[PDB]
């Protein structure tokens, strides 16, 4: 029937309003935000060429660092930063092809579908070795905004990443299954994280990169030991706020 | 004493969707308080029900959120939308954006039309929903033989039209490779019943905004990832 | 604290028939409603009890669902079926089709005969079931010394004959490499007691349809896969 | 019977922070009695609340636990401490020592000033806490426009000043690479309101001891390891 869209909202009708029909609703709850995001999606990749018992040193190789910034949003080395920082845009890895892979790390599924302005959740991380060679790796988890501590070994032949009280994981041997998984709590000093854009600066002299919020992440993952590892994120107890537009899709 | 165990054949497998949790490595941590927040929503369906813009083609094949009408009654529909959440026509609506991440839908669809012509302009449209089986309606005679509503212009600016869920199956596919009887459900065409009429000093063309969203009994199910593409 | 476990010697083994389930990777999903459906059956035995056609040999060695009878009483049986769910005679009956997927059976077998001759044709048959031990019955004198029923033609068209379950063992094999006392249980032969009799203007040959199925107390057990073959 | 198990994808992983215990290899052992002991404390926050010395710069760039004041009122602050648990100024205070092992803090900070001049010396200081946003206060006019307390010398020797927790976020970072609005919270400056005044026979310079500690509602959270360094 008639209505007035200028009001800001119109009724949600079913066939019975205008015609001789009945509602046809069937129970369903797979559309709940918590359920939808509570599943692992590829969100990053990591690579290391140094052994376990050595000093961890930030490195890049064909767009792959040996450390990661835990955030579904695009992250990568920004303007020669020591470690990956959150990006404001995505770029192709190749300077020619004009086709993916991208050089930036992110949860494609989150970026392509995040119809909200802010979000809150815990993060379940999964780290998998890309080949079947027996794993031998040490990973260090650093809470959001905490010191990276990229120091020297304090003792000979020991993994420097394990030389911390920070949560760290150590997997090695033919009894293992070449993967690691764990869940970390929301650690940002912010109440909720911006899911897409942050209309502001992060410092008092407004010199930072406009668009990036301060400490908008779940911490970082530093890795040492041989191999390339893919990373998955699973959003636990996911909560979203303020509906907003989805990424535009080219017209068919 | 130790418990005897039978290691299943899938040992070490990482199930991305297992309904179980993993080991907590930094527990007893307080989640930064956010009780002051507003605007939270818990169901993605909420988004699907928000009327969003359809992409109509401009005379120069440009995409616009409306279609034109004037002092005449064409023998063909002003616009034609195939009822599929896959329609290129609704490709950028919130409804389609959400539906792309689900396998099937069910329920009503709301097509909202907002008349933007002058207050002095009058006219009547016949919005029709033709179920499949006999092809697209070729004339007004055929269109009015299916589900339809006559929209008369006046004080109220918009018309909320519902495409009834008429299907051989309880659920319908969100997308498809080739159209099937479970992924394509007919067409919605809007015709000019009477010509748009108006006095002197009024532009001949009126613009009708077009939007879509899921109806009151609309639902989606089965979370999935849509065919990836390169933004541009 | 972690629980001590004793990994059994069969770790990682995939048991195709373990009575346990595995991990669900897409739960909380509704099975498309099908409450409108009819024709559901829950036991395969239902199928075994439906009388299905036996394959008799034509004069040109072709397979037909019946046998012939006329105005004479042969000194030999019109048809002979060895009681084995392996009989080539019942190879394409639903009974045999189901039995092929089970190891053993037990219970009655129903052999249904339907007279298709004219209404003017009369006659009597002696259906006999001869248990093994002394070989196949060579004469009517021998056949009528075992289990038998005399079938008289008339108003009612068919005769439901039951092969009693007479066995040294509680269960019997469905198939075999070589016949044994637990896989072969004798023969069912139908004789012409009195000649088929009729008036002028009636074809000399009458056709009797032949079918089989499990009886009221028939059962099968132990699901298995039968010897594979190439369809043709 | 043995229990079927699904070995998770993280088998064999050593979690340094798993909230679970491991196998005891020398149990039923008594921990050498220590009931006679005193001085036990159970919360590290206790330490954070103990006022400890700040490192001020000497005229020769040497570090001292106090600053000087005399018979004059400078147009600039006598000392300036940026409120960050990262301030080089409080680098060796127990507060900072503990905070270095935690990620975030919240609550009041206590800046204790102890006048060590003679009993004959008098004077007044204006201790100000300027929240960020408009930069560091350049004049007394600007400093007194923010949070401040006037400290008057006399019988009581010290002044306990509290830097209120004024933040856009509930928690603030303990350290940082580059200053952000969640890791730097303004400045604490102490000005000379009236000149230190005294009679003859009294040294012109008075020394004010400076200390810091967490206030009554101060807390730290998230145990971490600080950037290692070589002692010297």
């Amino acid at each position: 029937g008639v209505d007035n869209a200028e009001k800001g909202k119109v009724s949600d009708d079913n066939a019975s309003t205008d015609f001789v029909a009945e509602p046809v609703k069937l129970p369903e709850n797979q559309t709940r935000v918590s359920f939808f995001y509570d599943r692992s999606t590829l969100s990053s990749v990591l690579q290391s060429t140094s052994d376990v018992s050595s000093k961890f040193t930030p490195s890049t190789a064909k767009n792959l660092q040996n450390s990661i910034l835990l955030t579904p949003l695009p992250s990568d080395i920004v303007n020669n930063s020591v470690l990956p920082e959150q990006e404001r845009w995505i770029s192709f890895a190749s300077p020619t092809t004009q086709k993916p892979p991208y050089k930036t790390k992110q949860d494609w599924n989150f970026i392509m579908f995040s119809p909200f302005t802010y979000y809150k959740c815990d993060l379940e991380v999964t780290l998998s070795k890309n080949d079947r060679e027996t794993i031998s790796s040490v990973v260090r988890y650093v809470p959001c905004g905490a010191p990276s501590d990229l120091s020297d070994q304090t003792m000979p032949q020991t993994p420097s990443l394990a030389d911390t009280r920070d949560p760290h994981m150590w997997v090695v041997g033919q009894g293992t299954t070449n993967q690691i998984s764990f869940v970390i709590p929301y650690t940002s000093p912010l109440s909720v994280l911006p899911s897409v854009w942050f209309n502001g600066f992060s410092n008092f002299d407004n010199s930072s990169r406009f668009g990036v919020a301060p400490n908008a992440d779940f911490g970082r993952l530093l890795l040492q030991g041989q191999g390339t590892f893919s990373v998955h994120y699973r959003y636990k107890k996911m909560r979203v706020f303020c509906p907003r537009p989805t990424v535009f899709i080219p017209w068919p | 004493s130790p418990f005897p165990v039978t290691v299943r054949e899938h040992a070490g497998t990482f199930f991305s969707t297992t309904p179980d949790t993993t080991v907590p490595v930094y527990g007893n941590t307080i989640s930064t308080p956010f009780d002051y927040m507003c605007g939270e929503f818990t169901d993605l369906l909420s988004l699907c029900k928000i009327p969003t813009f359809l992409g109509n083609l401009d005379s120069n094949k440009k995409r616009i959120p409306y279609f034109s009408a004037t002092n005449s009654t064409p023998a063909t529909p002003l616009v034609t939308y195939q009822v599929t959440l896959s329609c290129s026509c609704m490709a950028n609506s919130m409804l389609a954006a959400v539906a792309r991440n689900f396998n099937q839908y069910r329920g009503s669809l709301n097509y909202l039309f907002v008349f933007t012509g002058s207050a002095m302009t009058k006219g009547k449209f016949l919005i029709s929903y033709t179920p499949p089986g006999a092809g697209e309606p070729k004339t007004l005679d055929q269109a009015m033989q299916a589900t339809y509503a006559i929209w008369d212009l006046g004080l109220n600016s918009s018309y909320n039209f519902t495409v009834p869920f008429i299907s051989p199956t309880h659920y319908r596919q969100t997308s498809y490779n080739t159209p099937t009887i479970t992924s394509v459900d007919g067409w919605l065409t809007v015709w000019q019943l009477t010509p748009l009429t108006y006095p002197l000093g009024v532009p001949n063309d009126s613009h009708i905004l077009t939007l879509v969203s899921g109806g009151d009994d609309f639902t989606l199910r089965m979370p999935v990832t849509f065919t990836k593409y390169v933004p541009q | 604290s972690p629980f001590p476990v004793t990994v059994r010697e069969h770790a990682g083994t995939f048991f195709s028939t373990t009575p346990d389930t595995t991990v669900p990777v897409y739960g909380n999903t509704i099975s498309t409603p099908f409450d409108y459906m009819c024709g559901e059956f829950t036991d395969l035995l239902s199928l075994c009890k439906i009388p299905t056609f036996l394959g008799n040999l034509d004069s040109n060695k072709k397979r037909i669902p019946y046998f012939s009878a006329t105005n004479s009483t042969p000194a030999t049986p019109l048809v002979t079926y060895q009681v084995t769910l392996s009989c080539s005679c019942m190879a394409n009956s639903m009974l045999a089709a189901v039995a092929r997927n089970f190891n053993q059976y037990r219970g009655s077998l129903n052999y249904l005969f339907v007279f298709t001759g004219s209404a003017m044709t009369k006659g009597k048959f002696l259906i006999s079931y001869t248990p093994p031990g002394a070989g196949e019955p060579k004469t009517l004198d021998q056949a009528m010394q075992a289990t038998y029923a005399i079938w008289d033609l008339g108003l009612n068209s068919s005769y439901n004959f039951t092969v009693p379950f007479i066995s040294p063992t509680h269960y019997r094999q469905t198939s075999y490499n070589t016949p044994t006392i637990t896989s072969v249980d004798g023969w069912l032969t139908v004789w012409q007691l009195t000649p088929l009799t009729y008036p002028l203007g009636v074809p000399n040959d009458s056709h009797i349809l032949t079918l089989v199925s499990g009886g009221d107390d028939f059962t099968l057990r132990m699901p298995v896969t039968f010897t594979k073959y190439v369809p043709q | 019977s043995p229990f079927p198990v699904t070995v998770r994808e993280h088998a064999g992983t050593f979690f340094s922070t798993t909230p679970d215990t491991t196998v005891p290899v020398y149990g039923n052992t008594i921990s050498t009695p220590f009931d006679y002991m005193c001085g036990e404390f159970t919360d590290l926050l206790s330490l954070c609340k103990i006022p400890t010395f700040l490192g001020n710069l000497d005229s020769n760039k040497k570090r001292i636990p106090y600053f000087s004041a005399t018979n004059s009122t400078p147009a600039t602050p006598l000392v300036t401490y940026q409120v960050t648990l990262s301030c080089s100024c409080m680098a060796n205070s127990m507060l900072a020592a503990v905070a270095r092992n935690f990620n975030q803090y919240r609550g009041s900070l206590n800046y204790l000033f102890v006048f060590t001049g003679s009993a004959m010396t008098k004077g007044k200081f204006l201790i100000s806490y300027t929240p960020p946003g408009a930069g560091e206060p350049k004049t007394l006019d600007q400093a007194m426009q923010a949070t401040y307390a006037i400290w008057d010398l006399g019988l009581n020797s010290s002044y306990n000043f509290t830097v209120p927790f004024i933040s856009p976020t509930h928690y603030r970072q303990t350290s940082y690479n580059t200053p952000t609005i969640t890791s730097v919270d303004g400045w604490l400056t102490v000005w000379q309101l009236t000149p230190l005044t005294y009679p003859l026979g009294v040294p012109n310079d008075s020394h004010i001891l400076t200390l810091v500690s967490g206030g009554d509602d101060f807390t730290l959270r998230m145990p971490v390891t600080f950037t290692k360094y070589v002692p010297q």
Binding site: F36, D38, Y186, M238 | N28, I30, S31, P33 | - | -
Partner: peptide
């Protein structure tokens, strides 16, 4: 959302999950 296990979580709720708290 995606919580389909009968037996209770092996780890405390305060450890398995972030602790939600209201500042008011």
């Amino acid at each position: 959302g995606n919580e389909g296990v009968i037996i209770n979580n092996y780890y405390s709720n305060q450890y398995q999950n972030s602790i939600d708290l209201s500042a008011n």
